């Protein structure tokens, strides 16, 4: 009873976020009563929260030795093992907890979450429904279930589901509980801007609570650039220096920084995955520090302070692998959110968010806890000019003239074309056309028979479906292909004689409203098709069914598998038009379609995430592809699918402007980012505090 | 195999 009062106090101290005081009290409980199963399990749980995973495991096992049927200890032990990447151990614990007590809702929810993470969405949904049957008031299970349903485009009772998510968040905010909607997912649901901001703020708060155990004073920050020989020391912090979308966007940026005025430190939160992405940032940054080797956030943050960083740049936000505890400790006088996270941090510890006028207009500035720091064009950038230079030019084969039926790309394309007798040059600067011919017939035969490659006139000619067999680093975008590649509509079962609208996003970004718009467009344009991905495959029959109920026959939507990075980008050349997802736009995916020369129709919303595509298109200089409402989006899209001369014009415009605009110009981007960094620095060095920048 | 942005 003395023991229980200590334990109960510790429990409350924990819920409040006084982690140190909770630990101290559980240990007191165990001094007074060593065989206290619950106190061991609760201490284990808080040690797990602090990263002390082995010490946690020890206490969970003591709890179970004391009470062999303590299902809750097994459930929480399972979470600890999952955090240590021991999936097998985790499943053994979850299944043991459910065997002890089949009515234990939390264990069902934990099992569901590991099914989800493993790619077993139907089993995750099933386990979440068991949890909700057992305990109907269970916000974590309801919101995680809602995300599973989103992932597979299960829209059963969609509008009441959405109302219920909002309702749960309202209730959770007013009670100062951690909201069950993850900040990253909050963009997909019709929550208020205040709610989205508050969800983010509460998640940042978990990092503040974790760093308080350390007892660190404020760090003292540079007031001038004297220790760094007049150089601004910029620190980029990311878990994604490796094969990840964010590296596919910004891997050239570190090495393009002006070493006369900047000194670049890249802090990796992940170990080296062996990829060229990681090799490049390690080689080209002035300094590369692997913080994955420094688990303790205190020691890791000290390193950033003694490197003397002026601007620390958060590339994760609330994405996997983040360590925002590093930014909670404020080791640098200016802390900015950049590129990797398409939302606000909600946190006081972040000063700016780097964005732009189109993406985040001054009006909607109360979305963000940060001050707006505008790049002059778009804050978005892509490494496509360096990664896929073989797509800078193309040739076609005239089967029956189309730009997107049978396409050739390669670094040595020019020399191959010059080896051929009868090549026609169509001005657009230009598109070589190989006529139907023995050579043209040899190529089409390789494709129709699914062969890997052939040789024509000494040139290597590769089937675009076989890139991982020819050169797996070229397939991933780690190397530029060294062969000429052939890409065709026939490879993907797309019609030779109709308009192909595409969208290559994960299926979770589609909602009922969006698919209704796409169905309207397809009905207005006979024979045309919508080209989607199995992303994941189990989303396919749901999409097809909701489209059938809207009046489209099944043949109007063609699904392809997710491809390796280079194939994905290359095959966008086969589409006529990309239809962007208004709920959450293609971000990296948007840069990808534009690099192929494919116009993208978008309807910007209010969230940062719903406005990225329109910012890209503005920078690109194609204002005619931005819709102000649903009717406009459909008219634009139908116009592009019926007015074939206007299609040819708009495509020609995207094809040229991907080079002549700033969109993919990483040097210009880096230089503009450098100016913006100096503004931020001077503003502060002159005694001022963070303010908006335009 | 295909890396993506995740929560
Ligand atoms: C923070 C991610 C910003 O990009 P977004 O458009 O949201 O893309 P994600 O869904 O997070 O990631 C998609 C990732 O997958 C590549 N991809 C897509 C499709 C395909 O067939 N093959 C791919 O390799 C995209 O290029 C992107 O990097
Ligand atoms: K079952």
**CATH of segment(s) A500-668:** 3.40.50.2000
Give the integer Cα–Cα distance in Å for A421 and A435. 10
Give the integer Cα–Cα distance in Å for A68 and A685. 61
Contact B6 A182 (CB under 8 A): no
Give the integer Cα–Cα distance in Å for A402 and A387. 26
Crossing angle of the two packed helices A87-100 and A71-83, in degrees rounded to 10: 170
SS3 A633: helix
In angstroms, how far is CA A330 from the centroid of its own chain?
25
Q: Which residues of A are catalytic?
A: 184
**Phi/psi of residue A127, each to 5°?**
-70, -35
Q: Are A359 and A378 in contact (CB under 8 A)?
A: yes
**Phi/psi of residue A625, each to 5°?**
-100, 0
**Phi/psi of residue A58, each to 5°?**
-60, -45
Crossing angle of the two packed helices A105-117 and A139-151, in degrees rounded to 10: 30
Please state the atom number of ligand 1 nearest to the C-alpha of residue A571: 21
Q: Are B2 and A562 in contact (CB under 8 A)?
A: yes
Q: Which residue has the tokens 């900047």?
A: A262
Which residues, at least 6 apart from A666, have a Cβ–Cβ distance to it below 8 Å?
A252, A253, A256, A381, A383, A385, A386
Query: For chain B, how are helix, strand and coil distributed in percent, rounded to 5?
Result: 0, 0, 100
Structural tokens at position A385: 């000019």
Give the integer Cα–Cα distance in Å for A435 and A32. 89
Q: Which residue has the tokens 């503005």?
A: A618
Q: Are A332 and A310 in contact (CB under 8 A)?
A: yes
First-last CA distance in chain B: 17
Contact B3 A245 (CB under 8 A): yes
To the question of whether residue A506 is assigned a binding role by annotation, the answer is: yes
SS3 A132: helix
The CA-CA-CA angle for residues A476, A573, A408, to 5°, reads 80
A-chain residues near B1 (CB < 8 A): 562
Q: Which residue has the tokens 């397809």?
A: A522
Bridge partners of A425, per DSSP, are A432
In angstroms, how far is CA A217 from the centroid of its own chain?
34
Q: Do domains A232-383+669-686 and A500-668 have the same CATH topology?
A: yes
**Closest of A379, A416, A409 to residue A392, by C-alpha:** A409
To the question of whether residue A330 is assigned a binding role by annotation, the answer is: no
Which residues, at least 6 apart from A37, have a Cβ–Cβ distance to it below 8 Å?
A63, A66, A67, A70, A73
Give the integer Cα–Cα distance in Å for A9 and A29. 10
Mutating which of A319, A380, A504, A569 best tests the B interface, going by the most B Cβ atoms within 10 A? A319
Burial profile A18-39: b = 16 or more Cβ within 10 angstroms, e = fewer: bbebbbebbebbbebbeebbbb
Q: Are A124 and A108 in contact (CB under 8 A)?
A: no
Which residues, at least 6 apart from A326, have a Cβ–Cβ distance to it below 8 Å?
A237, A267, A291, A297, A300, A301, A304, A312
Distance A245 CA to ligand 1 centre (A): 6
Distance from CA of B7 to the nearest CA of A (A): 4
Q: Are A126 and A93 in contact (CB under 8 A)?
A: no
Crossing angle of the two packed helices A644-660 and A612-620, in degrees rounded to 10: 80
In angstroms, how far is CA A543 from the centroid of its own chain?
22
Would you call A418 exposed, middle or buried from its count of C-beta atoms within 10 A (0-12, 13-18, 19+)?
A: exposed
Q: Are A680 and A268 in contact (CB under 8 A)?
A: no
**Closest of A640, A694, A356 to residue A499, by C-alpha:** A640
Provide the pairing of β-strand A453-456 with A459-463.
antiparallel
Would you call A109 exposed, middle or buried from its count of C-beta atoms within 10 A (0-12, 13-18, 19+)?
A: buried
Give the integer Cα–Cα distance in Å for A663 and A612. 12
SS3 A102: coil
A248 lines ligand 1 (CB under 6 A): yes
Provide the pairing of β-strand A529-534 with A406-409.
unpaired
Contact A185 B3 (CB under 8 A): no
Structural tokens at position A443: 């190529």
Strands of A569-612 (E only): list them.
Answer: 577-579, 600-601
Contact A244 B7 (CB under 8 A): no
Q: Which residues of B touch A (CB under 8 A)?
A: 1-7
Dihedral in degrees, nearest 10, Cα atoms A680, A685, A688, A690: 30
**Phi/psi of residue A614, each to 5°?**
-65, -40
**Phi/psi of residue A228, each to 5°?**
-105, 30
Give the integer Cα–Cα distance in Å for A174 and A178. 10
Distance from CA of B6 to the nearest CA of A (A): 6
Give the integer Cα–Cα distance in Å for A430 and A688. 53
Q: Are A668 and A348 in contact (CB under 8 A)?
A: no
Give the integer Cα–Cα distance in Å for A188 and A208. 26
Q: Are A201 and A612 in contact (CB under 8 A)?
A: no
To the question of whether residue A509 is assigned a binding role by annotation, the answer is: yes
Distance from CA of B4 to the nearest CA of A (A): 6
Taking residue A689's Cβ as centre, other Cβ atoms within 10 Å add up to 8
Burial profile A119-157: b = 16 or more Cβ within 10 angstroms, e = fewer: eebebbbbbbebbbebeeebbbbbbbbbbbbbbbbbbee
B-chain residues near A243 (CB < 8 A): 3
Bridge partners of A502, per DSSP, are A531, A578
Q: Are A43 and A55 in contact (CB under 8 A)?
A: no
Give the integer Cα–Cα distance in Å for A78 and A81. 5
Within a 13 Å sphere around the CA of A95, how many CA atoms are in the beta-carbon half?
Answer: 8
Bridge partners of A268, per DSSP, are A238, A290
**Closest of A65, A94, A58, A59 to residue A79, by C-alpha:** A94
Identify the DSSP state of A374.
E
Instruction: List strands edge to edge, sheet with A500-502.
Output: A557-561, A529-534, A500-502, A577-579, A600-601
B6 lines ligand 1 (CB under 6 A): no
Which residues, at least 6 apart from A132, have a Cβ–Cβ distance to it below 8 Å?
A105, A138, A141, A142, A145
* Structure-determination approach: X-ray
Write the Ramachandran bin of A321: left for phi over 0, alpha for psi from -120 to 50, otherwise beta: left
**Closest of A187, A147, A244, A123 to residue A508, by C-alpha:** A147
Please state the atom number of ligand 1 nearest to the C-alpha of residue B6: 11
Q: List, in sequence order, the alpha helices (H) in A271-336.
A: 276-284, 297-307, 325-328
Give the integer Cα–Cα distance in Å for A390 and A471. 15
DSSP string, A487-535: EETGGGT--TTS-EEE--S-GGG--HHHHHHHHHHHHHSTT-EEEEEET
Taking residue A598's Cβ as centre, other Cβ atoms within 10 Å add up to 23
**What is the interface size between A and B, counted as CB pairs within 8 Å?**
24
A250 lines ligand 1 (CB under 6 A): no
Q: Which helix (H) or strand (E) holds A289?
A: strand A287-290
Give the integer Cα–Cα distance in Å for A472 and A536. 23
Q: Which of A183, A185, A245 is facing B4, going by the closest CB pair?
A: A245
Bridge partners of A121, per DSSP, are none
Q: Tell which CATH architecture fits domain A232-383+669-686.
A: 3-Layer(aba) Sandwich (3.40)
Give the integer Cα–Cα distance in Å for A289 and A278. 12
Give the integer Cα–Cα distance in Å for A381 and A673. 11
**CATH of segment(s) A384-492:** 3.30.720.150
Q: Are A446 and A436 in contact (CB under 8 A)?
A: no
Contact A319 B5 (CB under 8 A): yes
**Closest of A580, A526, A521, A514 to residue A555, by C-alpha:** A526
Strands of A123-259 (E only): list them.
Answer: 232-238
Q: Are A264 and A285 in contact (CB under 8 A)?
A: yes
Task: Kindly report the three-state secondary structure assignment for every residue of A27-47.
Answer: HHHHHHCCCCHHHHHHHHHHH
Give the integer Cα–Cα distance in Å for A543 and A52. 44
Rg, Å, chain A Cα set: 27
Chain B CA closest to residue A339? B5
Give the integer Cα–Cα distance in Å for A211 and A213. 6
SS3 A371: strand
Rg, Å, chain B Cα set: 6
The CA-CA-CA angle for residues A365, A368, A374, to 5°, reads 65
Please state the atom number of ligand 1 nearest to the C-alpha of residue A560: 21
To the question of whether residue A692 is assigned a binding role by annotation, the answer is: no
Q: Which residue has the tokens 């390193």?
A: A303
Ligand closest to A115 (CA) is 2
Give the integer Cα–Cα distance in Å for A521 and A557. 12
Contact B7 A320 (CB under 8 A): yes
SS3 A84: coil
Identify the DSSP state of A373.
E
């Amino acid at each position: 009873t003395h023991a229980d009062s200590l334990n109960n106090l510790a429990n409350i101290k924990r819920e409040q976020g006084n982690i140190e005081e909770a630990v101290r009290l559980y240990r007191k409980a165990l001094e007074v009563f060593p065989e206290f199963a619950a106190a061991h399990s609760n201490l284990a749980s808080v040690l797990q929260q602090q990263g002390k995973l082995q010490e946690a495991l020890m206490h969970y096992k003591e709890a179970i030795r004391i009470s062999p049927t303590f299902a809750d200890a097994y459930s929480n032990m399972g979470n600890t093992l999952k955090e240590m990447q021991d999936v097998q151990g985790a499943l053994q614990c979850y299944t043991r907890a459910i065997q002890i007590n089949p009515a234990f809702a939390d264990a069902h929810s934990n099992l569901a979450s590991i099914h989800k993470d493993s790619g077993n969405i139907p089993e995750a949904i099933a386990s979440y429904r068991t949890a909700l049957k057992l305990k109907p008031d269970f916000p974590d299970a309801y919101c995680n279930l809602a995300h599973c349903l989103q992932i597979v485009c299960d829209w059963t009772d969609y509008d009441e589901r959405m109302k219920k998510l909002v309702s749960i968040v309202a209730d959770q905010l007013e009670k100062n509980r951690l909201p069950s909607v993850h900040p990253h997912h909050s963009m997909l649901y019709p929550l208020s801007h205040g709610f989205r901001k508050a969800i983010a703020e509460r998640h940042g708060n978990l990092c503040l609570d974790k760093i308080n155990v350390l007892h660190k004073p404020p760090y003292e920050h540079p007031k001038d650039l004297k220790l760094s020989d007049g150089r601004l020391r910029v620190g980029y912090v990311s878990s994604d220096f490796g094969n990840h979308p964010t590296s596919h966007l910004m891997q050239s940026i570190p090495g393009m920084h002006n070493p006369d005025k900047f000194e670049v430190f890249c802090y990796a939160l992940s170990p080296d995955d062996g990829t060229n992405f990681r090799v490049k940032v390690m080689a080209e940054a002035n300094h590369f520090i692997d913080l994955s080797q420094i688990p303790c956030n205190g020691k890791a943050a000290d390193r950033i302070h003694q490197d003397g960083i002026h601007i620390l740049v958060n590339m994760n936000g609330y994405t996997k692998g983040a360590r925002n505890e590093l930014f909670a400790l404020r080791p640098a006088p200016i802390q900015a959110m950049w590129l990797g996270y398409p939302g606000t941090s909600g946190a006081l510890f972040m000063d700016y968010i780097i964005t732009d006028q189109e993406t985040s207009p001054a009006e909607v500035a109360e979305q963000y806890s940060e001050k707006l720091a505008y790049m002059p064009h778009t804050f978005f950038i892509g490494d496509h000019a360096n990664m896929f230079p073989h797509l800078k030019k193309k040739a076609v084969i005239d089967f029956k003239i189309y730009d997107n039926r049978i396409v050739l790309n390669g670094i040595d394309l020019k020399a191959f074309l010059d080896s051929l007798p009868d090549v026609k040059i169509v001005k657009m600067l230009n598109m070589p056309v190989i006529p139907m011919n023995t050579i043209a017939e040899a190529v089409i035969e390789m494709i129709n028979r699914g062969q890997i490659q052939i040789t024509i006139n000494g040139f290597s000619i590769s089937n675009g479906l076989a890139t991982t067999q020819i050169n797996n680093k070229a397939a991933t975008g780690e190397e530029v292909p060294r062969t000429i590649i052939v890409t065709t509509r026939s490879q993907y079962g797309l019609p030779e004689d109709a308009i192909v609208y595409c969208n290559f996003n994960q299926l979770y970004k589609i909602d009922p409203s969006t698919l209704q718009m796409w169905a309207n467009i397809l009905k207005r344009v006979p024979n045309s098709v919508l080209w989607l991905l199995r992303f994941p495959a189990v989303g396919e029959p749901n999409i097809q069914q909701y489209a059938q109920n809207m009046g489209l026959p099944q043949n109007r939507i063609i699904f392809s598998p997710v491809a390796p990075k280079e194939e994905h980008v290359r095959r966008g050349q086969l589409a006529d038009v990309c239809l962007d997802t208004p709920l959450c736009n293609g971000h990296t995916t948007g840069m990808d379609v534009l690099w192929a020369g494919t116009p993208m129709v978008t309807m910007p919303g209010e969230t940062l995430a719903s406005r990225v595509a329109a910012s890209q298109l503005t920078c690109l200089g194609c204002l005619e592809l931005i819709a102000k409402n649903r009717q406009e989006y459909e008219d634009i899209a139908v116009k592009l699918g019926t007015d074939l001369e206007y299609l040819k014009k708009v495509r020609g415009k995207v094809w040229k402007q991907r080079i002549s605009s700033p969109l993919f110009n990483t040097k210009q981007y880096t230089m503009e980012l450098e100016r913006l960094y100096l503004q931020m620095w001077e503003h502060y060095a002159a005694g001022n505090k963070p303010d908006h920048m335009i | 195999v295909t890396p993506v942005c995740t929560a």
